[PDB]
Design a protein around this ligand. Sequence first.
Ligand SMILES: [Mg+2]
Ligand SMILES: [Mg+2]
Ligand SMILES: [Mg+2]
Ligand SMILES: [Mg+2]
Ligand SMILES: [Mg+2]
Ligand SMILES: [Mg+2]
Ligand SMILES: [Mg+2]
Ligand SMILES: [Mg+2]
Ligand SMILES: [Mg+2]
Ligand SMILES: [Mg+2]
Ligand SMILES: [Mg+2]
Ligand SMILES: [Mg+2]
Ligand SMILES: [Mg+2]
Ligand SMILES: [Mg+2]
Ligand SMILES: [Mg+2]
Ligand SMILES: [Mg+2]
Ligand SMILES: [Mg+2]
Ligand SMILES: [Mg+2]
Ligand SMILES: [Mg+2]
Ligand SMILES: [Mg+2]
Ligand SMILES: [Mg+2]
Ligand SMILES: [Zn+2]
Ligand SMILES: [Zn+2]
Lengths: 97, 38, 261, 177, 71, 162
Amino acid sequence: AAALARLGLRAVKQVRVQFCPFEKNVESTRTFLQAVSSEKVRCTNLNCSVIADVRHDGSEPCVDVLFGDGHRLIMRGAHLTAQEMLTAFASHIQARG
Amino acid sequence: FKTKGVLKKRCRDCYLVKRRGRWFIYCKTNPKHKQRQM
Amino acid sequence: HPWEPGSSRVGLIALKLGMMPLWTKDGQKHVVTLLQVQDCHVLKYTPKENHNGRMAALTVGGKTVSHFHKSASILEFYQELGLPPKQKVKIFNVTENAVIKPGTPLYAAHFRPGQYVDVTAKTIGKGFQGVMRRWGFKGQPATHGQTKTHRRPGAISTGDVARVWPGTKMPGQLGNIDRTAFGLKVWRINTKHNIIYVNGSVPGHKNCLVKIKDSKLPAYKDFCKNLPFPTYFPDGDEEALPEDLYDENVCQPGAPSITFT
Amino acid sequence: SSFSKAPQQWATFARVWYLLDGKMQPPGKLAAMASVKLQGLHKPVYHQLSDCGDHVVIMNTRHIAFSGNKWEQKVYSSHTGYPGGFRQVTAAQLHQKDPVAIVKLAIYGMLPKNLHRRTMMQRLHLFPDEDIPEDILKNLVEELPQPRKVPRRLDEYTQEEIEAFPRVWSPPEDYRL
Amino acid sequence: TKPIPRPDPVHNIEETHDLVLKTRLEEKGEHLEQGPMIEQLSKMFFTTKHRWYPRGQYHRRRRKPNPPKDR
Amino acid sequence: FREVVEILDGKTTIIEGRITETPQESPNPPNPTGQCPICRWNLKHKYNYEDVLLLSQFIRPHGGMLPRRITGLCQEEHLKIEECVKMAHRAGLLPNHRPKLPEGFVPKSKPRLNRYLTRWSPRSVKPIYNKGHRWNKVRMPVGSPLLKDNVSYSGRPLLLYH
RNA sequence: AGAGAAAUGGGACCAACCUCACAAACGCGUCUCAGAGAUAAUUAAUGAUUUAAUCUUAACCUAAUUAACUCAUAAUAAAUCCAGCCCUAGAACAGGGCACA
RNA sequence: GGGUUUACGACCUCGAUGUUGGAUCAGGACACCCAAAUGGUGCAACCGCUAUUAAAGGUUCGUUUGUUCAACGAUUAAAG
Ligand SMILES: [Mg+2]
Ligand SMILES: [Mg+2]
Ligand SMILES: [Mg+2]
Ligand SMILES: [Mg+2]
Ligand SMILES: [Mg+2]
Ligand SMILES: [Mg+2]
Ligand SMILES: [Mg+2]
Ligand SMILES: [Mg+2]
Ligand SMILES: [Mg+2]
Ligand SMILES: [Mg+2]
Ligand SMILES: [Mg+2]
Ligand SMILES: [Mg+2]
Ligand SMILES: [Mg+2]
Ligand SMILES: [Mg+2]
Ligand SMILES: [Mg+2]
Ligand SMILES: [Mg+2]
Ligand SMILES: [Mg+2]
Ligand SMILES: [Mg+2]
Ligand SMILES: [Mg+2]
Ligand SMILES: [Mg+2]
Ligand SMILES: [Mg+2]
Ligand SMILES: [Zn+2]
Ligand SMILES: [Zn+2]
């Protein structure tokens, strides 16, 4: 979470993580959710909206990040590592932001 | 840079790297902590 | 063949007449040397693969000499060529695109006013001279007590070496060696008498043969573009050049006596 | 066996031309057999006073191979005699300047330290690549074996042998290469 | 085995006079200096130039005129 | 094997994970009682820098080493295999395990010097100018010292310094 | 970063002055002086062992990079006539001339 | 770690290894003065201080003292 805290996340509008807690590949998804919902990310910018969608029969975790460059980053993370998702999101928002 | 025979970190930000056949204590916070094993 | 950026041109073999002054339009005064191109003929042509593997070689002969003092082989070569024997025979390394048929004469109009050249010749051989005149070593004082040491070189080596090093400067032959001066600018080109005015000192005594070539300095490597690439052919243009080709800064003999403003 | 004296002597002390490939070969192991064949220590009729010597043609000299980091550690120091003319050329720089010089100096060192060294060196022929004139090629008799077995690359192995070589470990599917 | 090569070509034969054509290939000669001769001999026999030089009286006197022979 | 696929569709990046099929271990190991892979396949003190088929089982397509926690090897053999992989890469084996750069493959350089059994890096060793005398000799190291316990069919010890 | 000027030293020559009662010698006088590679120390690009980072006694290509040191380039680089007479060529020996006059 | 001053022992020479300073000639080493590329500074810039790599080239002219040294005058990029 320190990476997203020091990267200046002021340039994001909405981050939603849609998942189902009763699946078998939600570890990295919930890790990413906590890393983006940490207190430092919140204190970096207060205008952002963090949403955690919880379902039971979706069976497909996903992350949608809409930011004001007219950009929509969609990551269907079902087998990717939480660290890989975090570093990819960081590189993308640092390249376009 | 300081050429020494025994390198040692001076703060928690110095990292030891093996380069050019020697050891180098590199510090980004305090640049005066740059040490090189002779 | 057309001119190329990585191409070179053949040189000449002239006769050093003497020295003269030459005033520039800015009021300055330079010293020129007169080189007379008496007879320049391409004797033989050696191919690139047969000479160096990188550049072809052209053989150039100097002025005319007598048949009654050359050997059988040289006279046979000149008989098969159809030309009288030459005194000095030199080799010029040129590219494979600037080759000329052997037996072709060359003229001092080969160069144009404003250019840099190189000059090679044997300097004035002063014979077996002392070290003070050869290398410039300082001598000992004259009369403060020195006995038979007014011009000795002194110590020649050290003690523990128990010998002298091969590069030790010592009295020996001085002067008779092929030396080359680079980057000499040419001012005036006389077409009638085939005289070239080369700036600066030219190594070699007067009335001697001198090998002139294009300046191989890196600052003047691509200056052969506006000049005639193969050589100066007086029959190709069907036009006679002026008597004296002056540079853009040489104060010509006929001048309005320029004054500053 | 029942030859005349002159042809028997000629066949006994005849000279032989050998071939030696130096591609991916150590200069030491090359110069070993090179000096052996030069001195003639492969003939039971060898003697010091006799001039029994054979010619060796070493090809693919530029493609020589040094073991270890000698390419950057080993130096070849020469001196022109003049003061300050003491040059120390790295092995790589010397090989880049002249590809023959490496194996030439190796053989010149492995040969004995007598006057016959120049004589038996004049019988040596070293070529950087496989560009041998015909008058030299038509002299070869046989080719000596390579002293070092050249190891295969990964793409040089056949797929049947690749599948014959068993898999040691079972990688998990969740990992990313 | 491989067959025996046999090369036979006398290009000096002229249709005008065979008596002259026979001598055209026999009157060939060449004379060089000591240096070039020694160099060519060394290049031919794959030796150095130090062997082809002659020797002195002190060594040419001490050679045994009638050396023993075995067999 | 897991692969990260990225799709660019109108300022919208789609990053997805794709799992492919990976080959499994051979069915019959010669010594199933060993815990370590090499120690149970009885390849201990058997592999070398020449054995490419064994070293190529666990290396990233870009020549990288595979982590020990995922491989499963004992520490000593892992270090030995790392040394062997470094030596093979320096020697010139594994040609298909280099990163593809179409911009850098065009400007060819001086030819790669043929080397093998190299210990250090080609760009980190200074040439010996003193070279020492017979009693004090600066020995030139060749090969890794970790492989001194290989089986010697000739019986002579391996010259680690020459 | 861009223009010039000078000195030292390497190598040369008398158009003028200076030494100068030989036609030459000489400085105090005049002319010229260079392209490429490589690096040691030190920076950054990608990247694993250590799924992050990290200039790498981890590979593959990377780039600004001390002087040396080599190489482009230049100098010599047409062999078997030499009695005699000259030479800005020379101790002797060598070398260049003796046809325009 | 080096053998640059003094001393230590007297191993080589006392049927001879001629002894300090200067003139000429310098060769070599780097434990680098300048010139070249850098790191760190209580480095704001000019001046500075130290460390690394680098030896192709240089390291002045005078008064006094026989002086090596030593003080002073004028400079240089420096007077190792
Ligand atoms: Mg003279
Ligand atoms: Mg005087
Ligand atoms: Mg007296
Ligand atoms: Mg007296
Ligand atoms: Mg006197
Ligand atoms: Mg001695
Ligand atoms: Mg000068
Ligand atoms: Mg005078
Ligand atoms: Mg990474
Ligand atoms: Mg960083
Ligand atoms: Mg060269
Ligand atoms: Mg003569
Ligand atoms: Mg002493
Ligand atoms: Mg003592
Ligand atoms: Mg004694
Ligand atoms: Mg005594
Ligand atoms: Mg005595
Ligand atoms: Mg010196
Ligand atoms: Mg140093
Ligand atoms: Mg400096
Ligand atoms: Mg010096
Ligand atoms: Zn620090
Ligand atoms: Zn194990």
